[PDB]
Amino acid sequence: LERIKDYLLMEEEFIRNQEQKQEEERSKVDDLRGTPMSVGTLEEIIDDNHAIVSTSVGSEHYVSILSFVDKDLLEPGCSVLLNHKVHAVIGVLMDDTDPLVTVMKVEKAPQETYADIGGLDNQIQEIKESVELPLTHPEYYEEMGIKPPKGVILYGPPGTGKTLLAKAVANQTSATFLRVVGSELIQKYLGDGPKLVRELFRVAEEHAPSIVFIDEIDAIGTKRYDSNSGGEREIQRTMLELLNQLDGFDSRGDVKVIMATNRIETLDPALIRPGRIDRKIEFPLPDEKTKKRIFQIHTSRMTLADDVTLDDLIMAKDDLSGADIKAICTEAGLMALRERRMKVTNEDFKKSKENVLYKKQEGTPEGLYL
Amino acid sequence: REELQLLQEQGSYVGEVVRAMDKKKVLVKVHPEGKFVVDVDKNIDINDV
Amino acid sequence: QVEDDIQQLLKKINELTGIKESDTGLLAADKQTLQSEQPLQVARCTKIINADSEDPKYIINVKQFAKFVVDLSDQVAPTDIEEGMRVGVDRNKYQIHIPLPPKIDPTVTMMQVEEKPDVTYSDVGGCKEQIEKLREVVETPLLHPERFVNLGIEPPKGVLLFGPPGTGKTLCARAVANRTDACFIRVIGSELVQKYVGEGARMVRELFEMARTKKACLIFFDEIDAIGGARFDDGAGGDNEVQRTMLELINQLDGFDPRGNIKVLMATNRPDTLDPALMRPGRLDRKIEFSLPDLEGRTHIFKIHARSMSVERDIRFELLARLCPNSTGAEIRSVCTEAGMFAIRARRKIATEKDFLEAVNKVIKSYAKFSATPRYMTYN
Amino acid sequence: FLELSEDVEEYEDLTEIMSNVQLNSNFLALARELDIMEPKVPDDIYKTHLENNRFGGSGSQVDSARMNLASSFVNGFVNQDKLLTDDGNKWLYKNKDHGMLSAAASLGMILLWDVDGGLTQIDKYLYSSEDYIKSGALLACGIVNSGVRNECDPALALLSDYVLHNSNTMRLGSIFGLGLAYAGSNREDVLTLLLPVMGDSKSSMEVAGVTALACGMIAVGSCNGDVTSTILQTIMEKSETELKDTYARWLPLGLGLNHLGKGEAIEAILAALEVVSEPFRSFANTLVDVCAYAGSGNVLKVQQLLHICSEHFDSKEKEEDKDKKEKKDKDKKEAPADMGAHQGVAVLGIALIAMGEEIGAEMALRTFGHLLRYGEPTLRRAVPLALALISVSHDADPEVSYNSIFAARLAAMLRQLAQYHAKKGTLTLCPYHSDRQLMSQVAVAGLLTVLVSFL
Numbered sequence A: 001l002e003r004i005k006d007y008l009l010m011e012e013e014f015i016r017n018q019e020q021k022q023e024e025e026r027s028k029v030d031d032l033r034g035t036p037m038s039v040g041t042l043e044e045i046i047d048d049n050h051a052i053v054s055t056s057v058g059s060e061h062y063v064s065i066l067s068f069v070d071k072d073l074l075e076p077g078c079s080v081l082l083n084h085k086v087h088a089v090i091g092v093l094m095d096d097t098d099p100l101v102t103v104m105k106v107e108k109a110p111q112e113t114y115a116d117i118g119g120l121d122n123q124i125q126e127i128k129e130s131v132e133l134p135l136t137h138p139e140y141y142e143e144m145g146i147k148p149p150k151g152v153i154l155y156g157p158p159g160t161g162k163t164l165l166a167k168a169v170a171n172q173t174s175a176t177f178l179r180v181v182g183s184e185l186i187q188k189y190l191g192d193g194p195k196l197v198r199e200l201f202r203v204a205e206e207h208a209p210s211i212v213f214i215d216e217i218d219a220i221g222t223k224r225y226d227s228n229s230g231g232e233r234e235i236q237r238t239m240l241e242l243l244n245q246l247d248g249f250d251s252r253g254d255v256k257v258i259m260a261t262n263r264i265e266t267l268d269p270a271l272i273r274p275g276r277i278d279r280k281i282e283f284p285l286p287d288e289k290t291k292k293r294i295f296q297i298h299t300s301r302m303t304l305a306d307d308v309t310l311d312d313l314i315m316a317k318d319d320l321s322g323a324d325i326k327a328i329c330t331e332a333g334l335m336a337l338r339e340r341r342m343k344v345t346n347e348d349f350k351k352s353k354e355n356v357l358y359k360k361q362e363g364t365p366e367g368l369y370l
Numbered sequence B: 001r002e003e004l005q006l007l008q009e010q011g012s013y014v015g016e017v018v019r020a021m022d023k024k025k026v027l028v029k030v031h032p033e034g035k036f037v038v039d040v041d042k043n044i045d046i047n048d049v
Numbered sequence C: 001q002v003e004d005d006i007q008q009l010l011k012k013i014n015e016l017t018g019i020k021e022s023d024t025g026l027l028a029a030d031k032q033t034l035q036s037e038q039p040l041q042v043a044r045c046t047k048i049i050n051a052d053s054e055d056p057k058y059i060i061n062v063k064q065f066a067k068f069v070v071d072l073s074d075q076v077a078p079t080d081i082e083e084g085m086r087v088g089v090d091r092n093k094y095q096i097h098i099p100l101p102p103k104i105d106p107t108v109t110m111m112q113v114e115e116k117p118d119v120t121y122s123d124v125g126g127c128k129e130q131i132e133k134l135r136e137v138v139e140t141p142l143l144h145p146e147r148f149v150n151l152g153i154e155p156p157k158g159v160l161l162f163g164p165p166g167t168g169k170t171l172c173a174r175a176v177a178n179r180t181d182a183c184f185i186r187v188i189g190s191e192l193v194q195k196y197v198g199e200g201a202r203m204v205r206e207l208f209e210m211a212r213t214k215k216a217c218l219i220f221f222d223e224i225d226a227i228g229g230a231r232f233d234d235g236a237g238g239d240n241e242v243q244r245t246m247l248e249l250i251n252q253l254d255g256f257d258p259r260g261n262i263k264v265l266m267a268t269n270r271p272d273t274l275d276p277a278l279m280r281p282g283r284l285d286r287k288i289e290f291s292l293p294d295l296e297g298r299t300h301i302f303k304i305h306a307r308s309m310s311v312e313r314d315i316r317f318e319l320l321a322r323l324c325p326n327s328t329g330a331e332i333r334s335v336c337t338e339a340g341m342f343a344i345r346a347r348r349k350i351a352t353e354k355d356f357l358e359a360v361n362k363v364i365k366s367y368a369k370f371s372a373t374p375r376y377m378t379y380n
Numbered sequence D: 001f002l003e004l005s006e007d008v009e010e011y012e013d014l015t016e017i018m019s020n021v022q023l024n025s026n027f028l029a030l031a032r033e034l035d036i037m038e039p040k041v042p043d044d045i046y047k048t049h050l051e052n053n054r055f056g057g058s059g060s061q062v063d064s065a066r067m068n069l070a071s072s073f074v075n076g077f078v079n080q081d082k083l084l085t086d087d088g089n090k091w092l093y094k095n096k097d098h099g100m101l102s103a104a105a106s107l108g109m110i111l112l113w114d115v116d117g118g119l120t121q122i123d124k125y126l127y128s129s130e131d132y133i134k135s136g137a138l139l140a141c142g143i144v145n146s147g148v149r150n151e152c153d154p155a156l157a158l159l160s161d162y163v164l165h166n167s168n169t170m171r172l173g174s175i176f177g178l179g180l181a182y183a184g185s186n187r188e189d190v191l192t193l194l195l196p197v198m199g200d201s202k203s204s205m206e207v208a209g210v211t212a213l214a215c216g217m218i219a220v221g222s223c224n225g226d227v228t229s230t231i232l233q234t235i236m237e238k239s240e241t242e243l244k245d246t247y248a249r250w251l252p253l254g255l256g257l258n259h260l261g262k263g264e265a266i267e268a269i270l271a272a273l274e275v276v277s278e279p280f281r282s283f284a285n286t287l288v289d290v291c292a293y294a295g296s297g298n299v300l301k302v303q304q305l306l307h308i309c310s311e312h313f314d315s316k317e318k319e320e321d322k323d324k325k326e327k328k329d330k331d332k333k334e335a336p337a338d339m340g341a342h343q344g345v346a347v348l349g350i351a352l353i354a355m356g357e358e359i360g361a362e363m364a365l366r367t368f369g370h371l372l373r374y375g376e377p378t379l380r381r382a383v384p385l386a387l388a389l390i391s392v393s394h395d396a397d398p399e400v401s402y403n404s405i406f407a408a409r410l411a412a413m414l415r416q417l418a419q420y421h422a423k424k425g426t427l428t429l430c431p432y433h434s435d436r437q438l439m440s441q442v443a444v445a446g447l448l449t450v451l452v453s454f455l
């Protein structure tokens, strides 16, 4: 019966997403403008009510200003609204940027808090103290004169929940948030490194205290030495642009960065210095104590005959990810669903444990220390 | 056959709508050209733009 | 089914909340001066090719169209409608009315610092002789132009700086910008890396236009690998236009009337990716690196990074400098902030010795350092 | 937490049937008064150690007999000893009439304990040369305790003035402070004193103000309310005189307070038959409509809220939409609404109330991101009050942000109030709905310090 409630909630949220002047003075604004408005570029403003502009085709004109709002808000470097009759300077353009700003801006917290992963709470406690504490409880930093950390690197074996940690911190926040898969810079475009970078961090500064979240750029740490005999492409120049944007000049502000990698030694050690990126966090193949918690989460709301013990599977083999546990908990459920059965016995878990674990295959010892 | 004067007319231009703004208008970037805040027809909603 | 109850009537009252607004939905400096300005004109700025003799008969280009043969209007100053001056040309009378400034490009004005960020000379401790040499480079010819004259020697107008990441290049940059007195200009290297053909060359032109307006100005490069020092080219034929921009920079930079009263500081983490068309002295005259301070500088950077944080008045910095074998001011400051975080892990009023001990652990001994645990004695 | 948990009725019924039995007399010790409060204040001094640079710094925030006057209040609500109480002289002599009420009551506010010390501190300011010192002094006697009841008679005896003499201001502080003092099964003797109070009807608002509010504090938790001749009398004597509409606002306050205690009351229909008229008494209708409907799964009045929320009279909008933080206080995830997305600026005031004081998550302070930035001085005044009630740098970060907002005088006062804030029990439900007519004189703000909802 709850599905009706969830569907009505989603459709009413869409209804709210659809729920998004002057009788004659606004019509005079409609004649203060020519209706095909345009986008230009101020070069100078000789302030005697006519300005010089620049166009996307490059024709630059003494064009008169028609102020309704304060006309001294717009600057050289800020665009204008020019007509097609005399390209008349119309007025208020709130400062717009690329289309690629709303693209990297997640508008939801679609998943849940630290109650989602199972057990790492020493370093989950670290990212806690380095994001959740400086944001929500910023007492002692002012009260002991000590500045909070800025950069956090996630690494280790993959499928530990780096994505899960990412979305978990994407839950518990009131600061604005941005989602950047930072490897997107494969163009054949010279320049165009700094365009995304400068506009991203300008937007980040203009909105709020925020997190600027780069995700999986472990390939792009291109060895910091050359490309071999002839290489130079743009990629070094773009990462150096991001480096200078981070820890050059022009004080950082209330901007946070969390980063995640699978392999870590192939990175660029001109970034991994503290100050530029502060924290580094290991996510290893955990233990046989929080595997119980990962099975506990993955057997929270599934039909399990409690006769079986997952601790038998934990006692079987000891090195696998929590994603492997999720794969087992779904796959044994499918093996139960072979023949319309209620709950899951032991042997579905056995066949599913064997089934998922077809990963490591090498070879031939060791094995033969011995 | 008399209807075919409508075929005899210049049709339209394509346009990149980056994002709409308040007060019943949108933005349009023409295919090689710059961006242009333009007006809408009576048949289209910004909820659908 | 109590959760069904909970979520269902929650969303139902939320639907009511939507229905609330759904049912509750039902010139003097701006308007009377408009039509007065409507008979103005959209007349175009230009750029003048030449001047004929005895008459204007001016030939002109705007940007892209053609090369325009024009008149001047009658109310001009016909003297200074010369070459290199952008002027305004009509759409009916085709004649020059009003001159304009040149293509100033006020994104090249945007790389000037325009401020003075505070990092004092008393904060950059550890390198009291490298910064002494850079002080000789910067402060002394801009204040005492005697001993160059009285001995007959030349100023080091270019100084490259190289070394490990974390070292203090940024600090020395903003340190001399703290006590500057001159026109200081930051240079993002990728302010030269624009899209279209032959424009970063013109960016170097904009640089030298700003340079030769004034006196004793300060161009500061940083990250010139973004500009580049690699003439990486064989039979692949890819990225080469930035090298054209950089050779333009060398041309207008040094050789055949160089800068003058201009002192340029550069920086790179990668000296082995440079071009020996800038390694030559006369261009770059001090290849000053920095190195890791032994103990006195590391205790000094402790003093600077702990004078303004709550610590115990009993702790030393000799032993803490010991347990930094190889480290920088960034790593030292990370130790300070990390021990502060440990003080937040307790509830202290100040920091203690063991706070910085475990912070040294976290920074250096809990660095990554691969692979990883060095548990052996063999030494002690 | 027995005395915190209990309402006005059952500690007086408890102290009368336990006045009969008591079985050890220690429940007559504990469960009336004075033993919720005897362990706390010494242990408040002991385990806490509060410094002096907010007395001096937050007590240094300049001067101007308002901000300074407010600062006295801020210093006064400091409670490490009753130091700001005994800080010399010439600070209250700079003070003026209704602020002299606030400062004469402020020695009440520093010390809501020390029964024996209350008489010997207020006694200098008792029966003094000034009307406001003596009337705010008996007000302070009503503040400090609720079980003494021997401070009644020096004030109680004087009260009658028959139009507008001194003891009517002692009636304001002493009818109000005695409303602070006792909650019987139905105390009737103090209400027989209240019959020449409403029959007196001074042009001073807070006579009938603390009449309705004080008899309501006596009458909150009544047995499904009552439509008795007390509040029936103030309905008929209310509709007697249509003058000074603050009367037509604060009398339905105490009306709806007597309506509190309801489970099933038809008193909205009864006062609907007796009362309703031109929107003064239809605003009384919406006040009884607010107070009779504390909150349940009863969404039909929430869609009634949806429709009559769009009413053209924009003060029944104010209280009728203001009922929300009473109604849905437990299922508070729905409590974020689009009241800021509306435009009837008092509605943004209503949501600004509706956050309030609990622990105040990041979404609430996120709403104070926009509500912090507004330009009207009653709404920019309205934001720091609930903003620093909801948090009782971090805390002081929006405060210095308000210093960035202004640096009017109202705004300065609002900032002072926010600083004071920085540093279904009915007792915390009444006084802020008493605060809801703030856009007014400092004479109204002479009672602003009677929202006594914190230990």
Ligand SMILES: Nc1ncnc2c1ncn2[C@@H]1O[C@H](COP(=O)(O)OP(=O)(O)OP(O)(O)=S)[C@@H](O)[C@H]1O
Binding pocket: A247, A248, A270, A275, C123, C124, C125, C126, C163, C164, C165, C166, C167, C168, C169, C170, C171, C268, C269, C301, C304, C328, C329, C330, C333
């Ligand atoms: N003596 C010092 N005192 C204080 N901080 C220091 C000192 N030496 C280095 N630092 C730190 O190092 C920073 C300056 O050096 P860098 O930022 O590494 O310059 P850089 O641009 O990062 O160099 P690279 O190679 O381009 S990353 C300072 O902001 C401090 O964090």
